[PDB]
Design a protein around this ligand. Structure first.
Ligand SMILES: [Mg+2]
Ligand SMILES: [Mg+2]
Ligand SMILES: [Mg+2]
Ligand SMILES: [Mg+2]
Ligand SMILES: [Mg+2]
Ligand SMILES: [Mg+2]
Ligand SMILES: [Mg+2]
Ligand SMILES: [Mg+2]
Ligand SMILES: [Mg+2]
Ligand SMILES: [Mg+2]
Ligand SMILES: [Mg+2]
Ligand SMILES: [Mg+2]
Ligand SMILES: [Mg+2]
Ligand SMILES: [Mg+2]
Ligand SMILES: [Mg+2]
Ligand SMILES: [Mg+2]
Ligand SMILES: [Mg+2]
Ligand SMILES: [Mg+2]
Ligand SMILES: [Mg+2]
Ligand SMILES: [Mg+2]
Ligand SMILES: [Mg+2]
Ligand SMILES: [Mg+2]
Ligand SMILES: [Mg+2]
Ligand SMILES: [Mg+2]
Ligand SMILES: [Mg+2]
Ligand SMILES: [Mg+2]
Ligand SMILES: [Mg+2]
Ligand SMILES: [Mg+2]
Ligand SMILES: [Mg+2]
Ligand SMILES: [Mg+2]
Ligand SMILES: [Mg+2]
Ligand SMILES: [Mg+2]
Ligand SMILES: [Mg+2]
Ligand SMILES: [Mg+2]
Ligand SMILES: [Mg+2]
Ligand SMILES: [Mg+2]
Ligand SMILES: [Mg+2]
Ligand SMILES: [Mg+2]
Ligand SMILES: [Mg+2]
Ligand SMILES: [Mg+2]
Ligand SMILES: [Mg+2]
Ligand SMILES: [Mg+2]
Ligand SMILES: [Mg+2]
Ligand SMILES: [Mg+2]
Ligand SMILES: [Mg+2]
Ligand SMILES: [Mg+2]
Ligand SMILES: [Mg+2]
Ligand SMILES: [Mg+2]
Ligand SMILES: [Mg+2]
Ligand SMILES: [Mg+2]
Ligand SMILES: [Mg+2]
Ligand SMILES: [Mg+2]
Ligand SMILES: [Mg+2]
Ligand SMILES: [Mg+2]
Ligand SMILES: [Mg+2]
Ligand SMILES: [Mg+2]
Ligand SMILES: [Mg+2]
Ligand SMILES: [Mg+2]
Ligand SMILES: [Mg+2]
Ligand SMILES: [Mg+2]
Ligand SMILES: [Mg+2]
Ligand SMILES: [Mg+2]
Ligand SMILES: [Mg+2]
Ligand SMILES: [Mg+2]
Ligand SMILES: [Mg+2]
Ligand SMILES: [Mg+2]
Ligand SMILES: [Mg+2]
Ligand SMILES: [Mg+2]
Ligand SMILES: [Mg+2]
Ligand SMILES: [Mg+2]
Ligand SMILES: [Mg+2]
Ligand SMILES: [Mg+2]
Ligand SMILES: [Mg+2]
Ligand SMILES: [Mg+2]
Ligand SMILES: [Mg+2]
Ligand SMILES: [Mg+2]
Ligand SMILES: [Mg+2]
Ligand SMILES: [Mg+2]
Ligand SMILES: [Mg+2]
Ligand SMILES: [Mg+2]
Ligand SMILES: [Mg+2]
Ligand SMILES: [Mg+2]
Ligand SMILES: [Mg+2]
Ligand SMILES: [Mg+2]
Ligand SMILES: [Mg+2]
Ligand SMILES: [Mg+2]
Ligand SMILES: [Mg+2]
Ligand SMILES: [Mg+2]
Ligand SMILES: [Mg+2]
Ligand SMILES: [Mg+2]
Ligand SMILES: [Mg+2]
Ligand SMILES: [Mg+2]
Ligand SMILES: [Mg+2]
Ligand SMILES: [Mg+2]
Ligand SMILES: [Mg+2]
Ligand SMILES: [Mg+2]
Ligand SMILES: [Mg+2]
Ligand SMILES: [Mg+2]
Ligand SMILES: [Mg+2]
Ligand SMILES: [Mg+2]
Ligand SMILES: [Mg+2]
Ligand SMILES: [Mg+2]
Ligand SMILES: [Mg+2]
Ligand SMILES: [Mg+2]
Ligand SMILES: [Mg+2]
Ligand SMILES: [Mg+2]
Ligand SMILES: [Mg+2]
Ligand SMILES: [Mg+2]
Ligand SMILES: [Mg+2]
Ligand SMILES: [Mg+2]
Ligand SMILES: [Mg+2]
Ligand SMILES: [Mg+2]
Ligand SMILES: [Mg+2]
Ligand SMILES: [Mg+2]
Ligand SMILES: [Mg+2]
Ligand SMILES: [Mg+2]
Ligand SMILES: [Mg+2]
Ligand SMILES: [Mg+2]
Ligand SMILES: [Mg+2]
Ligand SMILES: [Mg+2]
Ligand SMILES: [Mg+2]
Ligand SMILES: [Mg+2]
Ligand SMILES: [Mg+2]
Ligand SMILES: [Mg+2]
Ligand SMILES: [Mg+2]
Ligand SMILES: [Mg+2]
Ligand SMILES: [Mg+2]
Ligand SMILES: [Mg+2]
Ligand SMILES: [Mg+2]
Ligand SMILES: [Mg+2]
Ligand SMILES: [Mg+2]
Ligand SMILES: [Mg+2]
Ligand SMILES: [Mg+2]
Ligand SMILES: [Mg+2]
Ligand SMILES: [Mg+2]
Ligand SMILES: [Mg+2]
Ligand SMILES: [Mg+2]
Ligand SMILES: [Mg+2]
Ligand SMILES: [Mg+2]
Ligand SMILES: [Mg+2]
Ligand SMILES: [Mg+2]
Ligand SMILES: [Mg+2]
Ligand SMILES: [Mg+2]
Ligand SMILES: [Mg+2]
Ligand SMILES: [Mg+2]
Ligand SMILES: [Mg+2]
Ligand SMILES: [Mg+2]
Ligand SMILES: [Mg+2]
Ligand SMILES: [Mg+2]
Ligand SMILES: [Mg+2]
Ligand SMILES: [Mg+2]
Ligand SMILES: [Mg+2]
Ligand SMILES: [Mg+2]
Ligand SMILES: [Mg+2]
Ligand SMILES: [Mg+2]
Ligand SMILES: [Mg+2]
Ligand SMILES: [Mg+2]
Ligand SMILES: [Mg+2]
Ligand SMILES: [Mg+2]
Ligand SMILES: [Mg+2]
Ligand SMILES: [Mg+2]
Ligand SMILES: [Mg+2]
Ligand SMILES: [Mg+2]
Ligand SMILES: [Mg+2]
Ligand SMILES: [Mg+2]
Ligand SMILES: [Mg+2]
Ligand SMILES: [Mg+2]
Ligand SMILES: [Mg+2]
Ligand SMILES: [Mg+2]
Ligand SMILES: [Mg+2]
Ligand SMILES: [Mg+2]
Ligand SMILES: [Mg+2]
Ligand SMILES: [Mg+2]
Ligand SMILES: [Mg+2]
Ligand SMILES: [Mg+2]
Ligand SMILES: [Mg+2]
Ligand SMILES: [Mg+2]
Ligand SMILES: [Mg+2]
Ligand SMILES: [Mg+2]
Ligand SMILES: [Mg+2]
Ligand SMILES: [Mg+2]
Ligand SMILES: [Mg+2]
Ligand SMILES: [Mg+2]
Ligand SMILES: [Mg+2]
Ligand SMILES: [Mg+2]
Ligand SMILES: [Mg+2]
Ligand SMILES: [Mg+2]
Ligand SMILES: [Mg+2]
Ligand SMILES: [Mg+2]
Ligand SMILES: [Mg+2]
Ligand SMILES: [Mg+2]
Ligand SMILES: [Mg+2]
Ligand SMILES: [Mg+2]
Ligand SMILES: [Mg+2]
Ligand SMILES: [Mg+2]
Ligand SMILES: [Mg+2]
Ligand SMILES: [Mg+2]
Ligand SMILES: [Mg+2]
Ligand SMILES: [Mg+2]
Ligand SMILES: [Mg+2]
Ligand SMILES: [Mg+2]
Ligand SMILES: [Mg+2]
Ligand SMILES: [Mg+2]
Ligand SMILES: [Mg+2]
Ligand SMILES: [Mg+2]
Ligand SMILES: [Mg+2]
Ligand SMILES: [Mg+2]
Ligand SMILES: [Mg+2]
Ligand SMILES: [Mg+2]
Ligand SMILES: [Mg+2]
Ligand SMILES: [Mg+2]
Ligand SMILES: [Mg+2]
Ligand SMILES: [Mg+2]
Ligand SMILES: [Mg+2]
Ligand SMILES: [Mg+2]
Ligand SMILES: [Mg+2]
Ligand SMILES: [Mg+2]
Ligand SMILES: [Mg+2]
Ligand SMILES: [Mg+2]
Ligand SMILES: [Mg+2]
Ligand SMILES: [Mg+2]
Ligand SMILES: [Mg+2]
Ligand SMILES: [Mg+2]
Ligand SMILES: [Mg+2]
Ligand SMILES: [Mg+2]
Ligand SMILES: [Mg+2]
Ligand SMILES: [Mg+2]
Ligand SMILES: [Mg+2]
Ligand SMILES: [Mg+2]
Ligand SMILES: [Mg+2]
Ligand SMILES: [Mg+2]
Ligand SMILES: [Mg+2]
Lengths: 63, 100, 44, 76
RNA sequence: UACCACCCUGGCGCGGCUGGGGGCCUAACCCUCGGAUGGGGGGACAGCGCUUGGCGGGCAGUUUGACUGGGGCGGUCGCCUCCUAAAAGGUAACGGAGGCGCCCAAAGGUCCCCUCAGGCGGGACGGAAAUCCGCCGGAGAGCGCAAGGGUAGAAGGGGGCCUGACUGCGAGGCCUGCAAGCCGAGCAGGGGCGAAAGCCGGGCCUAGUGAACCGGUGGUCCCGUGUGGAAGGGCCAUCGA
RNA sequence: UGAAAUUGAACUGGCCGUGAAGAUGCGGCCUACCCGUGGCAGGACGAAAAGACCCCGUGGAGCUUUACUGCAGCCUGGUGU
RNA sequence: CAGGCUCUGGCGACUGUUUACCAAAAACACAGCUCUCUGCGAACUCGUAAGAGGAGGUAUAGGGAGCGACGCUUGCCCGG
RNA sequence: GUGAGGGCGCGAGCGAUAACGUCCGCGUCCGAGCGCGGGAACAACCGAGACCGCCAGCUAAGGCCCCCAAGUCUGGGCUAA
RNA sequence: UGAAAAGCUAACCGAGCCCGGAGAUAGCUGGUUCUCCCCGAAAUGACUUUAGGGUCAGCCUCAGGCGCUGACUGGGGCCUG
RNA sequence: GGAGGCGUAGGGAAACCGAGUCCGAACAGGGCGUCUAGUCCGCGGCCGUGGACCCGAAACCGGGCGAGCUAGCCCUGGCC
RNA sequence: CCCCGUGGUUCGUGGAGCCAUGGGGGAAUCUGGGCGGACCACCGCCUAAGGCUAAGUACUCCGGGUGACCGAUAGCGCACC
RNA sequence: CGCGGGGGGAACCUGGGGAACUGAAACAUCUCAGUACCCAGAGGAGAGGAAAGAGAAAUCGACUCCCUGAGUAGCGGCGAG
């Protein structure tokens, strides 16, 4: 009774004012040793998901 | 959950400042009330009147801002947007917050 | 051998890769920081 | 019996055909080496990919000993 | 090279703090003696309490992969190449064959110059094959490594200068269930080569790799539990599969 | 005097085909008036038992060890008595 | 009412013991041999403990282990 | 919901130019059309996609000597098993 | 407890019986009840201690919005081994 | 009964700023966000938490009940 | 009070305070002493190591009242000795 | 010699002890859960209770219970929870 906000999710995802799900980019914290500048740069931004988008949305809600 | 592979929990927490032990750090919270909505009614607006009628709700810190058209009325607040400041400057009077 | 080029007269870094035993004991190529613009960079 | 190997398909070839509108800089042909060469408003990247530099339409041309070229004949 | 001074190396005499080893004692504690307030043996040991590290199937909880012309045994498990694959893309089998888990401060950027393999003839040592000269010789050489595609109107060989093996971005696409992978014009900064046009965000290209979490080192607009610091955390960079 | 397991319902024949590849039940053909009693065990893939073998389940349990981790027990420094 | 006998192999010395309800045996046990622990508030076992067994026993005794009458004998190796 | 697919034709690998074998590709039918006519019988071969009724009619495949609807039809050959 | 078979411990002992935790869990098997009407799948792909289970995609269906775009077809242009 | 909730503004890790904001030296670019919706109750379809359609384990654990069967020993008698 | 081992709290050693306490060391009496999330300073809050205390709260053996509760396979296991 | 204890009570209450299945789609930290259950004690209730409190307001003012605060702040093999 009373759903629990999936703390593990909110700790890594943001819900955009329109209704989209934004999350950081993977692949930039380790594998690196000399990846292009182009790589790491584009790994700094954040993005959007699509269908799993709708999966997480449900794990928050009170949020 | 599921597949039983990696969910998508492959993504990661840039949500640094996730939180400390003693927890929340209490501090003044400013809510923006857009002056176009403020302009609606008249007389002289104050933090109380604003919450007393629809916006604010004891969030306590009043901040007129945003787009619209300023009423020539007096408007006590906790902070004005640069932009808001001027629209109302060229039409009426504008005092700052109490202090603490 | 992995390497990280520090900026001279400062403390920046870069994505690098020396070669140790192959004629690369030295290392001080030219690079470009965000503070200021363009300088030398040691091995480190 | 060692042999079960292979690599995954790289899905390459011409991506946009002759007489086809193209936007600013969308890919036109992905090729192993130089099965095709650049052309009017058509550069190529590291992997020998061929992409538009302008809008307009794509046209192919065989220049015999020279090679097979692909370019965009713009309009606006 | 008198004498005076701070101090070193090593040691001796005093006290301060502090510990290690032997011996004796008895009163704790323990055993014992026809009650014993006592006497005999042991003795600051042993027992027990807290805390240290160890040995530890005696006992306890679990773990001990999938594919698989039944299971096991054997083999295999990710990435590249080619074929199968039926002239788009894709496409299976414990179908046929081979590689990868790197390397290069030059094997990188640019400006200038240069063109092989191989066959015949001529040449002291050489000798089928070093190096030399002639002629023929469009790519059968070469391109660090597998294979394919490409390629001398250079991607190949040499040189001069150099370090774009940039920082801040990134229209637009390929590819794709997701995550990821890939190509990218042009803008700003600031720079390399070049007369200039212009080229440079590594290497002819397609393998040379690892989400997240946890933590390390450098930094830095940020946060810092009443306030100021500090502890710690965040952000950027990079590290340990 | 008087049970039992079993039992979808039956009006329950042979061969050669046939069919999910072993047919009283479909096809064709052949044989056969109706109902019992005594007796046999070829079929009804006859009864019985949700196959013990075998595989599967990220099932269980007993057991082993130089599998992992832990506990008893023991050994041990420090300290209290 | 009331033994069929004989010869000759294997296993186990022997009387015993056992899988109540598919195994009585070549399995266990046994007297006997060897190793080892134990000086007594013994070692070992049960118990958180007090305590108890050991034993109102004291190394010719007690616990543990393997072999298993008796005869002959029981080699070499101490790297793990 | 589904993530066992199955057969057939064609194009390949595997297989032995075996298999109601297997593994892909294109199509198809069964699956779910074991509803209807043909093929003796018979999911997937040929015909055809059943809203119900009719003691009407044309045709499909297949078939027209009897079981069994409809020609012992017409014409020209061949076969003697 | 056992002169040892894992024997026996109240007719089934590799850990007895009762009651409770308890509606353990069961990616497995079985079962799931009135009528009519429209549409109608799938047994693929990717990943999966995954393979008889799932997640996304594909394919079904309903509601709202879009309006000739869809299959298939004619012409023309390019790509293909 | 207005405590309280949702909605009226977003962006950013945050400090913060705000129809913007973040990245950035940038009045380049680009991400996200502006040009308004909402809420309360009933009803239905599905989702999450609980046994969550129903019936079924082999098992595990806690407290108790059993040696009137069977096993061993102890005491006291009997039998051959 | 500090240290060692722990428990409680949202707090799993975490920068780990607070409350509690098994072991060790071991104060003070208001110029005392605890606390405001390691620590330090400043500024606040509060007085430990003695005790008691109604109501508001929980429960239904028992009696009463009421039901879009059951009606003998239902309803408590028992309408019934 | 005098007053008191002893034992019982459905559920409820406090205190001393305190699991495993199961969840995590394996499992050990973790969860189930300080639940189940055992024990002692209280009583119509029991516990708690007048601040060495909270915590940011130079604010509040014993305890208990309900609403909300809030699935917030946090905790977490940052998994499941
Ligand atoms: Mg919104
Ligand atoms: Mg919102
Ligand atoms: Mg919306
Ligand atoms: Mg990474
Ligand atoms: Mg950056
Ligand atoms: Mg909320
Ligand atoms: Mg990360
Ligand atoms: Mg937060
Ligand atoms: Mg104005
Ligand atoms: Mg150097
Ligand atoms: Mg270094
Ligand atoms: Mg293969
Ligand atoms: Mg390939
Ligand atoms: Mg493949
Ligand atoms: Mg291939
Ligand atoms: Mg002295
Ligand atoms: Mg001294
Ligand atoms: Mg001294
Ligand atoms: Mg001494
Ligand atoms: Mg002495
Ligand atoms: Mg003496
Ligand atoms: Mg003495
Ligand atoms: Mg004396
Ligand atoms: Mg003592
Ligand atoms: Mg005495
Ligand atoms: Mg004495
Ligand atoms: Mg004495
Ligand atoms: Mg004495
Ligand atoms: Mg003495
Ligand atoms: Mg001594
Ligand atoms: Mg001592
Ligand atoms: Mg040892
Ligand atoms: Mg041992
Ligand atoms: Mg150990
Ligand atoms: Mg061990
Ligand atoms: Mg074990
Ligand atoms: Mg468990
Ligand atoms: Mg494992
Ligand atoms: Mg398997
Ligand atoms: Mg096999
Ligand atoms: Mg087979
Ligand atoms: Mg194997
Ligand atoms: Mg790759
Ligand atoms: Mg290929
Ligand atoms: Mg080819
Ligand atoms: Mg092809
Ligand atoms: Mg090919
Ligand atoms: Mg074809
Ligand atoms: Mg084709
Ligand atoms: Mg072919
Ligand atoms: Mg092809
Ligand atoms: Mg083959
Ligand atoms: Mg490596
Ligand atoms: Mg060089
Ligand atoms: Mg030559
Ligand atoms: Mg010649
Ligand atoms: Mg010569
Ligand atoms: Mg020679
Ligand atoms: Mg010669
Ligand atoms: Mg060529
Ligand atoms: Mg080669
Ligand atoms: Mg090559
Ligand atoms: Mg090819
Ligand atoms: Mg080649
Ligand atoms: Mg080639
Ligand atoms: Mg070639
Ligand atoms: Mg070549
Ligand atoms: Mg060159
Ligand atoms: Mg080069
Ligand atoms: Mg050069
Ligand atoms: Mg892009
Ligand atoms: Mg994508
Ligand atoms: Mg790659
Ligand atoms: Mg690719
Ligand atoms: Mg190269
Ligand atoms: Mg390629
Ligand atoms: Mg983890
Ligand atoms: Mg970190
Ligand atoms: Mg700093
Ligand atoms: Mg910045
Ligand atoms: Mg600060
Ligand atoms: Mg600071
Ligand atoms: Mg605080
Ligand atoms: Mg403050
Ligand atoms: Mg502070
Ligand atoms: Mg810091
Ligand atoms: Mg830091
Ligand atoms: Mg008959
Ligand atoms: Mg018949
Ligand atoms: Mg019959
Ligand atoms: Mg029939
Ligand atoms: Mg018949
Ligand atoms: Mg008869
Ligand atoms: Mg009779
Ligand atoms: Mg019979
Ligand atoms: Mg008989
Ligand atoms: Mg019959
Ligand atoms: Mg029979
Ligand atoms: Mg079965
Ligand atoms: Mg497993
Ligand atoms: Mg298991
Ligand atoms: Mg087990
Ligand atoms: Mg060892
Ligand atoms: Mg050992
Ligand atoms: Mg241990
Ligand atoms: Mg000790
Ligand atoms: Mg000690
Ligand atoms: Mg001592
Ligand atoms: Mg006689
Ligand atoms: Mg006799
Ligand atoms: Mg005789
Ligand atoms: Mg004999
Ligand atoms: Mg015998
Ligand atoms: Mg013998
Ligand atoms: Mg006898
Ligand atoms: Mg016996
Ligand atoms: Mg017997
Ligand atoms: Mg017997
Ligand atoms: Mg029995
Ligand atoms: Mg038996
Ligand atoms: Mg016998
Ligand atoms: Mg026996
Ligand atoms: Mg003996
Ligand atoms: Mg002997
Ligand atoms: Mg001895
Ligand atoms: Mg024991
Ligand atoms: Mg003990
Ligand atoms: Mg004794
Ligand atoms: Mg005795
Ligand atoms: Mg002995
Ligand atoms: Mg002899
Ligand atoms: Mg020997
Ligand atoms: Mg010998
Ligand atoms: Mg040895
Ligand atoms: Mg030795
Ligand atoms: Mg030795
Ligand atoms: Mg399948
Ligand atoms: Mg298939
Ligand atoms: Mg199909
Ligand atoms: Mg098919
Ligand atoms: Mg076949
Ligand atoms: Mg159909
Ligand atoms: Mg039919
Ligand atoms: Mg047939
Ligand atoms: Mg069918
Ligand atoms: Mg049919
Ligand atoms: Mg007619
Ligand atoms: Mg006709
Ligand atoms: Mg006809
Ligand atoms: Mg005729
Ligand atoms: Mg005729
Ligand atoms: Mg027995
Ligand atoms: Mg019983
Ligand atoms: Mg029985
Ligand atoms: Mg038994
Ligand atoms: Mg049992
Ligand atoms: Mg058991
Ligand atoms: Mg059940
Ligand atoms: Mg499941
Ligand atoms: Mg329909
Ligand atoms: Mg279909
Ligand atoms: Mg599957
Ligand atoms: Mg699903
Ligand atoms: Mg699905
Ligand atoms: Mg519609
Ligand atoms: Mg229209
Ligand atoms: Mg069209
Ligand atoms: Mg056409
Ligand atoms: Mg065409
Ligand atoms: Mg926000
Ligand atoms: Mg802009
Ligand atoms: Mg864009
Ligand atoms: Mg913008
Ligand atoms: Mg935009
Ligand atoms: Mg809005
Ligand atoms: Mg509603
Ligand atoms: Mg609803
Ligand atoms: Mg849902
Ligand atoms: Mg929920
Ligand atoms: Mg259940
Ligand atoms: Mg449900
Ligand atoms: Mg549910
Ligand atoms: Mg008895
Ligand atoms: Mg008896
Ligand atoms: Mg303290
Ligand atoms: Mg201690
Ligand atoms: Mg310690
Ligand atoms: Mg402590
Ligand atoms: Mg506790
Ligand atoms: Mg704790
Ligand atoms: Mg908690
Ligand atoms: Mg905790
Ligand atoms: Mg703590
Ligand atoms: Mg304390
Ligand atoms: Mg203490
Ligand atoms: Mg205190
Ligand atoms: Mg406080
Ligand atoms: Mg503080
Ligand atoms: Mg206070
Ligand atoms: Mg007080
Ligand atoms: Mg006091
Ligand atoms: Mg007091
Ligand atoms: Mg008090
Ligand atoms: Mg008190
Ligand atoms: Mg009271
Ligand atoms: Mg009440
Ligand atoms: Mg009543
Ligand atoms: Mg009543
Ligand atoms: Mg009533
Ligand atoms: Mg009623
Ligand atoms: Mg009745
Ligand atoms: Mg009844
Ligand atoms: Mg009745
Ligand atoms: Mg009845
Ligand atoms: Mg009752
Ligand atoms: Mg009654
Ligand atoms: Mg009676
Ligand atoms: Mg009665
Ligand atoms: Mg009295
Ligand atoms: Mg009383
Ligand atoms: Mg009482
Ligand atoms: Mg308690
Ligand atoms: Mg307790
Ligand atoms: Mg378990
Ligand atoms: Mg398990
Ligand atoms: Mg707990
Ligand atoms: Mg309790
Ligand atoms: Mg008591
Ligand atoms: Mg009582
Ligand atoms: Mg009270
Ligand atoms: Mg009290
Ligand atoms: Mg007081």
């Amino acid at each position: 009774p009373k759903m629990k906000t999936h703390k593990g999710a909110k700790k890594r995802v943001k819900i955009t004012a329109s209704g989209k799900v934004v999350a950081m980019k993977t692949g930039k914290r380790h594998l690196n040793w000399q990846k292009s500048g182009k790589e790491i740069r584009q790994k700094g931004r954040k993005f959007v998901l699509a269908k799993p988008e709708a999966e997480r949305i449900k794990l928050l809600l009170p949020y | 959950f599921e597949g039983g592979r990696s969910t998508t929990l492959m993504r990661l927490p840039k949500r640094g400042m996730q939180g400390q032990v003693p927890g929340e750090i209490k501090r003044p919270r400013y809510q923006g009330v857009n002056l176009k909505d403020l302009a609606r009614f008249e007389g002289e607006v104050t933090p109380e009147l604003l919450v007393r009628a629809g916006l604010l709700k004891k969030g306590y810190r009043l901040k007129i801002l945003g787009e619209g058209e300023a009423k020539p009325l007096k408007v006590v607040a906790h902070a004005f947007s640069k932009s808001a400041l001027e629209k109302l400057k060229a039409a009426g009077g504008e005092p700052v917050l109490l202090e603490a | 051998l992995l390497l990280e080029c520090t900026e001279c007269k400062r403390r920046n870094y870069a994505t690098e890769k020396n070669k140790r035993n192959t004629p690369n004991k030295l290392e001080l190529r030219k690079y470009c920081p965000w503070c200021r613009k363009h300088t030398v960079h040691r091995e480190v | 019996t060692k042999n079960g190997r292979d690599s995954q398909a790289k899905r390459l070839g011409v991506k946009r055909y002759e007489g086809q509108v193209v936007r600013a800089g969308n890919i036109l042909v992905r090729q192993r080496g130089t099965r095709f060469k650049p052309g009017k408003n058509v550069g190529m990247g590291r992997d020998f990919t061929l992409f538009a530099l302008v809008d307009g339409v794509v046209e192919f041309q065989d220049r015999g000993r020279l090679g097979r070229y692909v370019h965009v004949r713009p309009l606006a």
